Design a protein around this nucleic acid. Structure first.
Lengths: 178, 246, 193
RNA sequence: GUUGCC
DNA sequence: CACTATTTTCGGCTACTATAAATAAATGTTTTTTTCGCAGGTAACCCTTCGTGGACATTT
DNA sequence: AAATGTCCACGAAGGGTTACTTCGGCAACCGAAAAAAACATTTATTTATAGTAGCCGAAAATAGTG
């Protein structure tokens, strides 16, 4: 949506007065034409106390998930930060409540986990590295090296800052002389 | 196609940014094609938003700008980069926020929401200007505050230069360099302005169009004797006032 | 102060605003302005939402007058949660010490529901039998900690079905704004007591 | 204060 | 007469809902101050300019 | 000398400008805008209740078709 010109035989190298301005609605109206049309039934909009309040329906847990839940709770004490991404589209809040409701549901199966203070049955070696094979890079030094690049760009724009400043005072000092 | 556009911008960046180019030398410089397809790649180069169209008065003029600022403005959207062109067109004296609204027709909310993001992109700062105080003035980081200093403590400069003449304009300029005075730039015009305030106070006198002699306020400093004149002012109804005739 | 007079002149139009949309009779609006005026002095309005604090202020004068206007109708048009509006209602009513305040009698809500319930011409017999059911609802132990709009929507459900069949479990929800499965329990609550 | 009428 | 076919219904599972109490930190919302808004009906009757003639002045 | 050149002030004519048009009585009825400042909420974490309310959902069950 840049400005457009044309080449007349009468006046060559003339620029279009209508392309100088933009309408800001023709682009919006294209997609609004290509939206689905439905006829509102005033019964459909019904609302109750369960409206406009955050919280949703949790997808109930399966036993295939529990072996990735018990063992992630067997390795660490109780660490909700890194186990969240293990269940990729589950969030930090409802998985904390999954720790809470199991206290009343299975109080004794949890009580075996904190007694276990040792490396467990050695089958987590795959799940040790299945977590690691996502974006394989030395993260203990990957964050260091590009952070040093960032302050290098900030130092160069700081060099560009003062070198712009010194020539500016130099130029208008000459205007003060004249 | 592309290679013809790669040749022309290397010619635009060939010269130093001044000496603003035009067509009458461009067809002398790049005239291997006719004007019908030369314009079509320049309008395509306008579609690649590198070339801009600057104005010397009453006639058609061109100006190429560097690729470094072209990439960072391509990150913005249509309206985001559009308002960024107005501030960089101003450049040296800033631009007033209400006048920016006048040149867009975008109303007060959509312009302020745009530049709120733009300061976080570190392309625009806000300065305080004095020829119209308390107005919003925006510039780049290129720092042109062309608009001595307005706030006080001129008297610290002023009270010392009386002492140099008390014992008895070019003779001042060597004296003001020393004595660790908190100054950054002086000029012979400033000392001429700094001296005539004392002329209005009759602290010293102007003779022979540049010389200065003291009006002997030193004996008044230490009927025309307003010091040591303390009044009674209490329990005396018979006093004289300068007001209370109106 | 001029800004003191200006900040309530804006607050006058806001009370003038929502009273129009809720069909409030105007002798509550001017009475509700007295609540906001003295609650202005107690430093309660600073920080909180202006569009919220007038909604709780107007609702107090709705229940001193004992009208049919229940709280969630205020929450609907600003498209916010109900529990936000009731939160500042509790945090207000403690601070300026409202002691006397009438109970939300659910008997009010029946005879206002019938006009929008598009029922037959015999609209007085459908509410006379209902208030006999509503006083039968009262001495029996169904609603003591439950919702007023819940049980007041269950009594009109039973009276409508025993003469008409206009009840669809949905039209009375479109009036009472309480969900469908929470009222199915209420007739099973009534059935085996 | 403003209109209508004899 | 019988295995279906969708429904009716419980049903447990979960997600909030005031409650007091600590920060510490950040955010978001609203009065109270201190401060300049762009062309770049009839009839006196007094008011202004038009005009015309006053005597000084300077040349012949 | 003197005649014309010139300059000057009072008056003439019209110029637009400003307060003007019954006497009764009955009914009624009505600036904005940035900054400074204050302060609640969200941000967790408990840990006890009952209630909605949603979503499911499977399994209880009468029912629909061959």
């Amino acid at each position: 949506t840049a400005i457009q010109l044309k080449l007349n035989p009468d006046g060559t190298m003339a620029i279009d007065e209508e392309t100088m301005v933009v309408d800001r609605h023709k682009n919006a109206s294209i997609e609004n034409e290509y939206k689905e049309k439905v006829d509102e039934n005033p019964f459909a909009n019904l609302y109750n106390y369960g409206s406009y309040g955050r919280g949703s329906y949790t997808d109930p847990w399966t036993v295939e998930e529990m072996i990735k839940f018990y063992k992630a709770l067997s390795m660490w004490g109780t660490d909700f930060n890194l186990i969240s991404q293990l269940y990729p589209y589950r969030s930090r809040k409802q998985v904390k409540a999954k720790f809470v409701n199991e206290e009343k549901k299975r109080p004794i199966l949890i009580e075996l986990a904190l007694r276990s203070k040792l490396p467990p049955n050695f089958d987590e070696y795959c799940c040790e590295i299945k977590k690691n094979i996502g974006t394989v890079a030395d993260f203990n030094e990957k964050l260091i090296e590009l952070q040093n690049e960032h302050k290098h760009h900030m130092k160069e724009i700081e060099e560009a800052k003062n070198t712009a400043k010194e020539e500016d005072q130099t130029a208008q000092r000459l205007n003060d002389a004249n | 196609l592309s290679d013809n556009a790669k040749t022309l911008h290397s010619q635009m960046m060939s010269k130093g940014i001044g000496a603003l180019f035009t067509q009458q030398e461009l067809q002398k410089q790049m005239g291997i094609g006719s004007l019908t397809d030369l314009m079509s790649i320049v309008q395509e180069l306008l579609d690649k938003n590198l070339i801009k169209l600057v104005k010397q008065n009453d006639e058609l003029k061109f100006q190429g700008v560097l690729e470094s600022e072209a990439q960072k403005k391509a990150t913005m959207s249509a309206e985001e980069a559009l308002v960024y062109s107005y501030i960089e067109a101003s450049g040296r004296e800033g631009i007033w926020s209400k006048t920016i609204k006048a040149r867009t027709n975008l109303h007060q909310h959509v312009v302020l929401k745009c530049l709120k993001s733009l300061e976080s992109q570190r392309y625009v700062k806000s300065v305080k200007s004095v020829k119209f105080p308390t107005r919003k003035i925006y510039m780049l980081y290129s720092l042109q505050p062309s608009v001595e200093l307005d706030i006080e403590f001129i008297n610290s400069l002023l009270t010392i230069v009386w002492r140099f003449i008390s014992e008895n304009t070019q003779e001042i300029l060597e004296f003001i360099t020393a004595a660790q005075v908190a100054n950054v730039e002086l000029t012979p015009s400033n000392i001429r302005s700094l001296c005539e305030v004392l002329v209005y106070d009759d602290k010293l006198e102007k003779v022979t169009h540049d010389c200065y002699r003291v009006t002997l306020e030193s004996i008044l400093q230490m009927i025309f004797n307003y010091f040591k004149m303390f009044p009674a002012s209490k329990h005396d109804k018979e006093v004289v006032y300068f007001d209370e005739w109106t | 102060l001029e800004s003191r007079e200006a900040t309530l002149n804006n607050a006058r139009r806001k009370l003038r605003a929502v009273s129009y949309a809720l069909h409030i009779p105007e002798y509550i609006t001017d009475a509700a302005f007295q609540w906001y005026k003295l609650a202005l002095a107690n430093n309660f309005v600073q920080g909180r939402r202006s569009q919220n604090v007038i909604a709780s202020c107007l609702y107090v004068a709705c229940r001193k007058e004992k009208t049919h206007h229940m709280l969630i109708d205020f929450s609907s048009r600003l498209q916010v949660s109900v529990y936000s509006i009731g939160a500042t209602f509790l945090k207000m009513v403690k601070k300026l010490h409202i002691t006397e305040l009438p109970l939300a009698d659910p008997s009010l809500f029946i005879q206002h529901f019938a006009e929008k319930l598009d029922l037959a011409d015999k609209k007085i017999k459908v509410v006379k039998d209902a208030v006999k059911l509503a006083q039968r609802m009262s001495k029996d132990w169904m609603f003591e900690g439950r919702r007023p709009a819940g049980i007041a929507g269950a009594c009109i459900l039973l009276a409508c079905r025993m003469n008409n069949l206009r009840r669809t479990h949905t039209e009375i929800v479109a009036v009472s704004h309480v969900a469908e499965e929470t009222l199915q329990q209420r007739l099973n609550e009534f059935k085996n007591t």
